[PDB]
Design a protein around this motif. Structure first.
Motif, PDB file in Angstrom:
ATOM      1  N   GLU A 137      46.659  79.800  53.951  1.00  0.00           N
ATOM      2  CA  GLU A 137      46.215  80.993  53.502  1.00  0.00           C
ATOM      3  C   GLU A 137      44.712  81.148  53.360  1.00  0.00           C
ATOM      4  O   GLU A 137      43.968  80.172  52.690  1.00  0.00           O
ATOM      5  N   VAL A 138      43.983  82.127  53.945  1.00  0.00           N
ATOM      6  CA  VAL A 138      42.765  82.042  54.098  1.00  0.00           C
ATOM      7  C   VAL A 138      42.270  83.761  53.641  1.00  0.00           C
ATOM      8  O   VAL A 138      42.778  84.688  53.727  1.00  0.00           O
ATOM      9  N   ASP A 139      41.261  83.663  52.804  1.00  0.00           N
ATOM     10  CA  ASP A 139      40.569  85.023  52.368  1.00  0.00           C
ATOM     11  C   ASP A 139      39.922  85.564  53.684  1.00  0.00           C
ATOM     12  O   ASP A 139      38.999  84.955  54.124  1.00  0.00           O
ATOM     13  N   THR A 140      39.864  86.683  53.854  1.00  0.00           N
ATOM     14  CA  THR A 140      39.361  87.553  55.087  1.00  0.00           C
ATOM     15  C   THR A 140      37.566  87.282  54.935  1.00  0.00           C
ATOM     16  O   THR A 140      37.020  87.263  56.015  1.00  0.00           O
ATOM     17  N   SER A 141      37.171  87.277  53.860  1.00  0.00           N
ATOM     18  CA  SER A 141      35.922  87.288  53.637  1.00  0.00           C
ATOM     19  C   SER A 141      35.263  85.758  53.920  1.00  0.00           C
ATOM     20  O   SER A 141      34.214  85.556  54.222  1.00  0.00           O
ATOM     21  N   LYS A 142      36.180  84.871  54.127  1.00  0.00           N
ATOM     22  CA  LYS A 142      36.093  83.428  54.719  1.00  0.00           C
ATOM     23  C   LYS A 142      36.000  83.510  56.328  1.00  0.00           C
ATOM     24  O   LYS A 142      35.743  82.365  56.864  1.00  0.00           O
ATOM     25  N   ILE A 143      36.681  84.404  56.789  1.00  0.00           N
ATOM     26  CA  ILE A 143      36.792  84.468  58.355  1.00  0.00           C
ATOM     27  C   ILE A 143      35.525  84.794  58.958  1.00  0.00           C
ATOM     28  O   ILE A 143      34.576  85.564  58.675  1.00  0.00           O
ATOM     29  N   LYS A 144      35.008  83.841  60.105  1.00  0.00           N
ATOM     30  CA  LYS A 144      34.000  84.265  60.957  1.00  0.00           C
ATOM     31  C   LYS A 144      34.358  84.651  62.032  1.00  0.00           C
ATOM     32  O   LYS A 144      34.088  85.917  62.380  1.00  0.00           O
ATOM     33  N   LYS A 145      34.923  84.156  63.245  1.00  0.00           N
ATOM     34  CA  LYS A 145      35.033  84.826  64.418  1.00  0.00           C
ATOM     35  C   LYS A 145      36.519  84.915  64.482  1.00  0.00           C
ATOM     36  O   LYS A 145      37.264  84.555  64.212  1.00  0.00           O
ATOM     37  N   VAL A 146      36.707  86.398  65.296  1.00  0.00           N
ATOM     38  CA  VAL A 146      38.277  86.773  65.437  1.00  0.00           C
ATOM     39  C   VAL A 146      38.258  87.108  66.913  1.00  0.00           C
ATOM     40  O   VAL A 146      37.195  87.909  67.226  1.00  0.00           O
ATOM     41  N   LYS A 162      34.131  72.837  56.448  1.00  0.00           N
ATOM     42  CA  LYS A 162      34.363  72.456  57.801  1.00  0.00           C
ATOM     43  C   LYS A 162      34.936  73.929  58.561  1.00  0.00           C
ATOM     44  O   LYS A 162      35.006  74.954  57.759  1.00  0.00           O
ATOM     45  N   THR A 163      34.931  74.014  59.803  1.00  0.00           N
ATOM     46  CA  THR A 163      35.311  75.161  60.579  1.00  0.00           C
ATOM     47  C   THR A 163      36.657  75.068  60.828  1.00  0.00           C
ATOM     48  O   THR A 163      37.307  74.060  61.322  1.00  0.00           O
ATOM     49  N   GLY A 164      37.648  75.829  60.248  1.00  0.00           N
ATOM     50  CA  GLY A 164      39.008  75.840  60.297  1.00  0.00           C
ATOM     51  C   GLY A 164      39.491  76.854  61.509  1.00  0.00           C
ATOM     52  O   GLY A 164      38.608  77.699  61.694  1.00  0.00           O
ATOM     53  N   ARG A 165      40.584  76.796  61.986  1.00  0.00           N
ATOM     54  CA  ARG A 165      40.999  77.398  63.005  1.00  0.00           C
ATOM     55  C   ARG A 165      42.328  77.995  62.649  1.00  0.00           C
ATOM     56  O   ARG A 165      43.328  77.217  61.834  1.00  0.00           O
ATOM     57  N   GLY A 166      42.648  79.210  63.063  1.00  0.00           N
ATOM     58  CA  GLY A 166      43.952  79.843  62.767  1.00  0.00           C
ATOM     59  C   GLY A 166      44.298  80.910  63.533  1.00  0.00           C
ATOM     60  O   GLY A 166      43.378  81.415  64.220  1.00  0.00           O
ATOM     61  N   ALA A 167      45.606  81.499  63.581  1.00  0.00           N
ATOM     62  CA  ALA A 167      45.990  82.760  64.414  1.00  0.00           C
ATOM     63  C   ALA A 167      47.136  83.170  63.932  1.00  0.00           C
ATOM     64  O   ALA A 167      48.373  82.427  63.459  1.00  0.00           O
ATOM     65  N   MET A 225      48.163  87.669  70.233  1.00  0.00           N
ATOM     66  CA  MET A 225      47.821  86.643  69.361  1.00  0.00           C
ATOM     67  C   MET A 225      46.226  86.960  68.714  1.00  0.00           C
ATOM     68  O   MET A 225      45.507  87.248  69.735  1.00  0.00           O
ATOM     69  N   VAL A 226      46.171  87.010  67.415  1.00  0.00           N
ATOM     70  CA  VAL A 226      44.907  87.421  67.050  1.00  0.00           C
ATOM     71  C   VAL A 226      44.423  86.026  66.414  1.00  0.00           C
ATOM     72  O   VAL A 226      45.053  85.292  65.464  1.00  0.00           O
ATOM     73  N   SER A 227      43.405  85.499  66.857  1.00  0.00           N
ATOM     74  CA  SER A 227      42.821  84.012  66.652  1.00  0.00           C
ATOM     75  C   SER A 227      41.593  84.153  65.938  1.00  0.00           C
ATOM     76  O   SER A 227      40.874  85.195  66.001  1.00  0.00           O
ATOM     77  N   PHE A 228      41.197  83.100  65.218  1.00  0.00           N
ATOM     78  CA  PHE A 228      40.021  83.197  64.461  1.00  0.00           C
ATOM     79  C   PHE A 228      39.589  81.633  63.893  1.00  0.00           C
ATOM     80  O   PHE A 228      40.359  80.651  63.717  1.00  0.00           O
ATOM     81  N   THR A 229      38.314  81.779  63.570  1.00  0.00           N
ATOM     82  CA  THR A 229      37.800  80.733  62.753  1.00  0.00           C
ATOM     83  C   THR A 229      37.410  81.216  61.437  1.00  0.00           C
ATOM     84  O   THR A 229      37.537  82.236  61.201  1.00  0.00           O
ATOM     85  N   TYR A 230      37.417  80.081  60.478  1.00  0.00           N
ATOM     86  CA  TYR A 230      36.948  80.214  59.007  1.00  0.00           C
ATOM     87  C   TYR A 230      36.284  79.106  58.422  1.00  0.00           C
ATOM     88  O   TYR A 230      36.306  78.226  58.804  1.00  0.00           O
ATOM     89  N   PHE A 257      48.988  81.742  57.429  1.00  0.00           N
ATOM     90  CA  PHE A 257      49.417  81.268  58.646  1.00  0.00           C
ATOM     91  C   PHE A 257      49.662  79.753  58.660  1.00  0.00           C
ATOM     92  O   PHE A 257      49.587  79.149  57.699  1.00  0.00           O
ATOM     93  N   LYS A 258      50.269  79.307  59.748  1.00  0.00           N
ATOM     94  CA  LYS A 258      50.767  77.891  59.949  1.00  0.00           C
ATOM     95  C   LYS A 258      49.732  77.161  60.822  1.00  0.00           C
ATOM     96  O   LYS A 258      49.532  78.045  61.846  1.00  0.00           O
ATOM     97  N   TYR A 259      49.352  75.994  60.588  1.00  0.00           N
ATOM     98  CA  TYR A 259      48.350  75.392  61.687  1.00  0.00           C
ATOM     99  C   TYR A 259      48.794  74.017  61.403  1.00  0.00           C
ATOM    100  O   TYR A 259      48.525  73.297  60.214  1.00  0.00           O
ATOM    101  N   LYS A 260      49.142  73.297  62.313  1.00  0.00           N
ATOM    102  CA  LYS A 260      49.270  71.795  62.301  1.00  0.00           C
ATOM    103  C   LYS A 260      50.647  71.678  61.629  1.00  0.00           C
ATOM    104  O   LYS A 260      50.426  70.710  60.573  1.00  0.00           O
TER     105      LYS A 260
END
Length: 66
Positions: free
Chosen positions: A14-23, A39-44, A29-34, A6-9
């Motif tokens: 690229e994040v591994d799904t196992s690192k994804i916290k909230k969705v 730190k807690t990153g954000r992406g969608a 739009m599918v949004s999530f934190t990881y 994904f693109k952010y800022k």
DNA sequence: GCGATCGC
DNA sequence: GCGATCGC
């Protein structure tokens, strides 16, 4: 191994799904934190660009009754 | 404007 | 407390 890209800022990522916290969903739009190495990153992503694994996780979050 | 969060 | 952020 399922990697969500994904693109952010403007930064490509690229994040591994196992690192994804909230969705959660915001329209189409599918949004999530990881876990971003400490730190807690954000992406969608657009639902269309979401790998099945991420949609699986979203469905699981949507079933949460607390 | 929607959800939800981070980073001010 | 709120702007930026993500897709639309």
């Amino acid at each position: 191994m399922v990697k969500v890209k994904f693109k952010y800022k403007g930064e490509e990522k690229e994040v591994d799904t196992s690192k994804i916290k909230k969705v959660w969903r915001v329209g189409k739009m599918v949004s999530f934190t990881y876990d971003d190495n400490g730190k807690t990153g954000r992406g969608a992503v657009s639902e269309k660009d979401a790998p099945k694994e991420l949609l699986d996780m979203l469905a699981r979050a949507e079933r949460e009754k607390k």
